Write an enzyme that holds these catalytic residues in place. Structure first.
Site, PDB file in Angstrom:
ATOM      1  CG  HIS A 144      -2.140   0.885   0.717  1.00  0.00           C
ATOM      2  ND1 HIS A 144      -3.010   1.870   1.218  1.00  0.00           N
ATOM      3  CD2 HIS A 144      -3.079   0.316   0.415  1.00  0.00           C
ATOM      4  CE1 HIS A 144      -4.170   2.244   0.676  1.00  0.00           C
ATOM      5  NE2 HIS A 144      -4.510   1.215   0.418  1.00  0.00           N
ATOM      6  NE  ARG A 177      -4.282   0.331   3.137  1.00  0.00           N
ATOM      7  CZ  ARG A 177      -4.853  -0.368   3.455  1.00  0.00           C
ATOM      8  NH1 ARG A 177      -3.999  -2.028   3.517  1.00  0.00           N
ATOM      9  NH2 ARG A 177      -5.746  -0.057   2.382  1.00  0.00           N
ATOM     10  CG  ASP A 187       4.303  -1.525   9.989  1.00  0.00           C
ATOM     11  OD1 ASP A 187       5.417  -1.728   9.959  1.00  0.00           O
ATOM     12  OD2 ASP A 187       3.095  -1.954  10.027  1.00  0.00           O
TER      13      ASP A 187
END
Lengths: 221, 229, 226
Positions: A144, A177, A187
């Site tokens: 993503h 996210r 991340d």
């Protein structure tokens, strides 16, 4: 794994042309570190947002399969990005989706196999369709976020008049996210570094170069 | 929009871009970690971890990396690039890299540096860095985001576009320039982290500029001809 | 000491009287208080073990937490170099079965009863990785861990018998404590303090004649099987 030689509608690059994410990135924060306290705090801050307008947008952003990431930049780009309305641009963005989501991230994802936040906490993300599969993956780095940030860099090269809105939009995808529980903040932070790297590699690739020129001409016409 | 300052219209050897083409770093970046936050505890821990390293090989390299004025960032990529980056040996490449130093160093960072005016670590702790030569200049500056790290990472991205065969060593070298600024105390870790984002953005902007595009082509051609020797 | 069983009431499980026992409440510092940085670390270490419960280590952890008292001796066989059992080494097995409640109970009682610290699985309202022993322990005081005191005491004694493999015995004893953290029955700080009371109770046992005799019998058994 899969690269340009096995599914050329989604990759421009080979396995050697790919970034070694494992050598480039720092390790993720380990449980016990201050950095991981901060990851936990950012997960809670994101959770309290799920029931706002910003949380609804977050869930819509986590719906996007690969093919709809292009599409979600339309408002920021100034016009619709679709196979119908801007096909050469759409084709360019669909062909780089796996370079950034998979090739740039594969060596690190599989080495650390970091657990994702919804699994760590035993609770659901903010749209549960999109979980059942990703759960088994390594959280670090985000594929993503890498895709989204690379896309925003390419689009910025194509329409600089709106770089600031294009770039914020790309940044916000990563934040979505976090809000939705799919990834830790760190991340997303590392995903954006591999996003920049994979954009440079693409700028060395002749097929990419041709398609990018076609897309710039589409935009000028 | 950006505060006032130089751009291509006043120093066309050091910028490709106008003030109007610059990224709004203040709008793009999150604020620096605030004192009271967990993130600032981590910046303090990373300052200490870097300080204990100053007397090692890595501290040696860190101190050598902080000597570089702007113009010598080109040079320090030579080992990683595979060949010497110099006015003599690769003039088109050196010219490409020199013409962009303040696009990444100044325009990419300006609205944010001037808005937060973050205190640097050595000033915060009242002690000297591991190379006291460039210090006085920088103390009064805004630490966030790091202009030096922005230059280094943007340079690495361009160099990678030119010689993909050594992407991995080039990017590592670029990455490590930022760590050196942490090891010596010139910047907080979160300054380096944000510098790499605005560095990427500014490389995207540069790729939309005709003078840059053209010079980049000249450099790619120079590099292909030197691979035949 | 608070009241409880000792050598005079269950002589197959103790060598020491209540008057001979270490005052663990006097010796150990208080447990980390909620609000403290140290308790932040206990919480991080609980989460760190929880993510390990799926790994092979967590499987070893769960098998280690099956052991009631009778049966802790046995789990040192691989490390000790030969089987420790009523059949194969009766004197050693007797030595270790008689000291189990000295280290597990006497060395820990005053402190356990004064602090009554909540165990992690109760604090988080979640189950351990091994739901068989849970229901009974939940109510006790977590600090210090009686299991870890037993394990560390046994490791010190066995090292005294077979120094040739002391490093592997001590490690094994150490890991017994870590398994209690991985599986959720103790905080890291419970295990840390239990190893101190384990050392202390081993010194005490070394001043007790019944113990010294059984220890000599076991040293002879071990040299004769070598």
């Amino acid at each position: 794994g899969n690269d340009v030689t096995t599914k050329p509608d989604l990759y421009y690059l080979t396995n050697d042309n790919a970034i070694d994410s494992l050598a480039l990135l720092p390790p993720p924060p380990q449980i016990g570190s201050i950095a991981f306290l901060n990851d936990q705090a950012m997960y809670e801050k994101g959770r309290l947002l799920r029931n706002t307008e910003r949380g609804k947008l977050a869930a819509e952003d986590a719906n996007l399969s690969s093919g709809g990431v292009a599409n979600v930049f339309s408002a920021a780009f100034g016009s619709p990005i679709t196979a119908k309305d801007s096909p050469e641009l759409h084709k360019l963005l669909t062909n780089m989706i796996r370079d950034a989501g998979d090739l740039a991230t594969r060596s690190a994802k599989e080495y650390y196999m970091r657990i994702r936040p919804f699994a760590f906490y035993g609770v659901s993300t903010c749209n549960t369709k999109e979980q059942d599969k990703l759960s088994k993956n390594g959280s670090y780095p985000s594929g993503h976020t890498s895709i989204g940030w690379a896309t925003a860099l390419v689009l910025s090269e194509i329409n600089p008049a709106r770089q600031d809105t294009i770039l914020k939009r790309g940044y916000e995808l990563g934040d979505s996210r976090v809000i939705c529980g799919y990834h830790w903040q760190s991340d997303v932070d590392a995903a954006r570094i591999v996003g920049s790297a994979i954009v440079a590699t693409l700028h060395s690739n002749p097929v990419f170069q041709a398609q990018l020129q076609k897309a710039k001409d589409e935009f000028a016409n």
